[PDB]
Design an enzyme around this catalytic site. Structure first.
Site, PDB file in Angstrom:
ATOM      1  N   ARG A  45     -38.443  29.647  10.111  1.00 47.19           N
ATOM      2  CA  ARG A  45     -39.785  29.104  10.325  1.00 47.19           C
ATOM      3  C   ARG A  45     -39.868  28.319  11.635  1.00 47.19           C
ATOM      4  O   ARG A  45     -40.938  28.238  12.258  1.00 47.19           O
ATOM      5  CB  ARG A  45     -40.158  28.182   9.166  1.00 47.19           C
ATOM      6  CG  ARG A  45     -40.271  28.867   7.802  1.00 47.19           C
ATOM      7  CD  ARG A  45     -38.903  29.059   7.142  1.00 47.19           C
ATOM      8  NE  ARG A  45     -37.969  28.001   7.490  1.00 47.19           N
ATOM      9  CZ  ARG A  45     -36.666  28.186   7.683  1.00 47.19           C
ATOM     10  NH1 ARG A  45     -36.121  29.360   7.567  1.00 47.19           N
ATOM     11  NH2 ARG A  45     -35.875  27.197   7.991  1.00 47.19           N
ATOM     12  N   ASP A  84     -33.034  14.821   8.863  1.00 51.91           N
ATOM     13  CA  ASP A  84     -32.854  16.146   8.293  1.00 51.91           C
ATOM     14  C   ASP A  84     -31.380  16.556   8.354  1.00 51.91           C
ATOM     15  O   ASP A  84     -31.043  17.687   8.684  1.00 51.91           O
ATOM     16  CB  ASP A  84     -33.786  17.170   8.946  1.00 51.91           C
ATOM     17  CG  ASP A  84     -33.908  18.448   8.127  1.00 51.91           C
ATOM     18  OD1 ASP A  84     -33.587  18.431   6.913  1.00 51.91           O
ATOM     19  OD2 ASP A  84     -34.313  19.471   8.708  1.00 51.91           O
TER      20      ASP A  84
END
Ligand code: M2Z
Ligand code: M2Z
Ligand code: M2Z
Ligand code: NH4
Length: 288
Positions: A17, A135
Site C-alpha cells: 500500500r 511503527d
C-alpha cells in the site's frame, strides 16, 4: 560541475500500500529507492521533515541518502533513497534461518541500540531531538552483513524537543483502548517499547537451544487472523490481556530465560512500568 542524479532501478524488492521499494544503482553503488504511493505521501513528507531537522547518522538506523520530489504531468513523484541492505528485512531473514546465541543477542542489541538512539534527546550543536518511531516491527528492521540490524521507516515518527496509526498487530494496549496520553511524548516511546518486546519474541523463537527451535511466526499468530482488525487486537491485548507465549524449552537456556524476562518487562499494561530502551540495552549487554 555535473550533478549526477540518474538512478538505475534494477529490481523491485517490495510492493505494498505504501508504494514500492527498488534496488537501484547510483555511481556504481547499490541504493534502495522507495517510491511512494499517492495514498502514503504523508510518510514521505514526515520522513523528509525529520531529516531536514536532524540528519540522523547511526549504524543501527537505515542510512539516508536523499529525498526527491519530481513534478509530473498531473501528479508529483516522491522518492526516498537510502542505503541498500541485500539481506532484506528481519521478517524475511527469520523465515529462512535459525540463530545461535551470539547472533540472536547481536540482532536484538543492535535493534535496542538504534531505538535508544532515536529516543534520546542529545543537546548541543551535533545533537538531536528525541524521536519515537511509532511503527516498529520486523518488516521495518533490515539485516546487515555484519550481523547487526538497522531500523527503517520514519514515516510515522514524532519528534520532541489526518493523524495516522501504526501496524495493528503491534499496537500497545493504550493505543487499542484509546487511553494513550497523546500530549506526553514519553507515551510514544512506551508504545515503541511494547513493539520492541514483540520483535524480541519473534527473534528469540528462532534461536536454537538443546536442538530445539520454534518456527517463525508473527506476534499473536495463534489468536488473531491475518490482517487483524482493531477490535480483534483490542480483545486480545486489552480485554483479555493476553501476551505472546513463552515456550517451556526457553527455561532450559540461560539466554532465552533472560530474554523472556526482558520481553515481559516490555509488555506491562501500565506503560510507565515498561523498561526504557537504555535499560534494555544495559540488560542485553549483561546477558552472556
Ligand atoms: C539534486 O539531486 C541530487 C543530487 C545528487 C548529487 C550528485 N552529485 C553531487 C552532489 C553534490 C553534493 C555536494 C555538493 N557541495 C558540497 C558543499 N560545497 C559545495 C559542493 C555539490 C554536489 C549531489 C547532492 C545526488 C542525487 O541522488 C543520489 C540527487 O537526487 C536525489
Ligand atoms: C547524497 O549522497 C551522496 C553524495 C556524494 C557527494 C557528491 N559530491 C560531493 C559531495 C560532497 C563534497 C564535499 C562536501 N563538503 C561539505 C562542507 N565542507 C566541505 C566538504 C559535501 C558533500 C558528496 C557527499 C557522494 C555519495 O557517495 C559517494 C553520496 O551517497 C550516495
Ligand atoms: C522497511 O523500509 C524500507 C526498507 C528499504 C530496504 C533497504 N534495503 C533493502 C531492502 C530489501 C531488499 C530485499 C528484500 N528481499 C525480500 C524478499 N525477497 C527478496 C528481496 C527485502 C528488503 C529494503 C526493503 C528501503 C526503504 O526506503 C528506501 C524503506 O523505507 C524506509
Ligand atoms: N501522524
Amino acid at each position: 560541475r555535473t550533478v549526477a542524479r540518474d538512478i538505475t532501478l534494477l529490481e523491485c524488492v517490495g510492493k505494498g500500500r505504501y508504494g514500492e521499494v527498488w534496488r537501484g544503482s547510483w555511481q556504481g553503488e547499490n541504493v534502495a529507492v522507495k517510491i511512494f504511493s499517492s495514498r502514503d505521501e504523508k510518510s514521505w513528507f514526515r520522513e523528509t521533515e525529520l531529516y531536514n531537522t536532524v540528519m540522523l547518522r547511526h549504524e543501527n538506523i537505515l542510512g539516508f541518502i536523499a529525498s526527491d520530489m519530481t513534478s509530473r504531468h498531473s501528479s508529483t513523484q516522491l522518492w526516498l533513497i537510502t542505503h541498500y541492505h541485500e539481506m532484506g528485512s528481519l521478517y524475511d531473514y527469520l523465515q529462512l534461518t535459525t540463530l545461535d546465541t551470539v547472533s540472536c543477542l547481536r540482532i536484538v542489541l543492535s535493534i535496542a541500540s538504534g531505538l535508544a538512539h532515536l529516543h534520546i534527546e542529545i543537546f548541543g550543536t551535533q545533537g538531536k531531538p528525541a524521536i519515537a518511531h511509532r511503527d516498529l516491527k520486523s518488516k521495518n528492521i533490515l539485516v546487515k552483513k555484519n550481523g547487526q540490524c538497522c531500523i527503517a521507516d520514519l514515516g510515522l515518527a514524532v519528534m520532541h524537543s489526518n493523524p495516522r496509526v501504526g501496524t495493528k498487530r503491534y499496537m500497545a494496549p493504550e493505543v487499542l483502548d484509546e487511553t494513550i496520553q497523546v500530549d506526553c511524548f514519553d507515551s510514544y516511546k512506551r508504545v515503541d517499547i511494547w513493539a520492541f518486546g514483540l520483535v524480541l519474541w519473534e527473534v528469540a523463537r528462532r534461536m536454537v537451544s538443546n536442538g530445539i527451535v520454534e518456527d517463525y511466526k508473527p506476534p499473536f499468530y495463534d489468536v488473531v487472523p491475518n490482517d487483524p482488525s482493531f477490535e480483534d487486537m483490542r480483545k486480545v491485548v486489552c480485554v483479555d490481556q493476553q501476551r505472546p507465549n513463552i515456550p517451556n524449552r526457553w527455561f532450559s537456556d540461560p539466554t532465552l530465560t533472560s530474554l523472556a524476562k526482558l520481553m515481559k518487562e516490555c509488555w506491562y499494561q501500565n506503560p510507565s512500568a515498561r523498561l526504557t530502551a537504555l535499560r534494555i540495552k544495559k540488560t542485553l549487554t549483561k546477558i552472556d
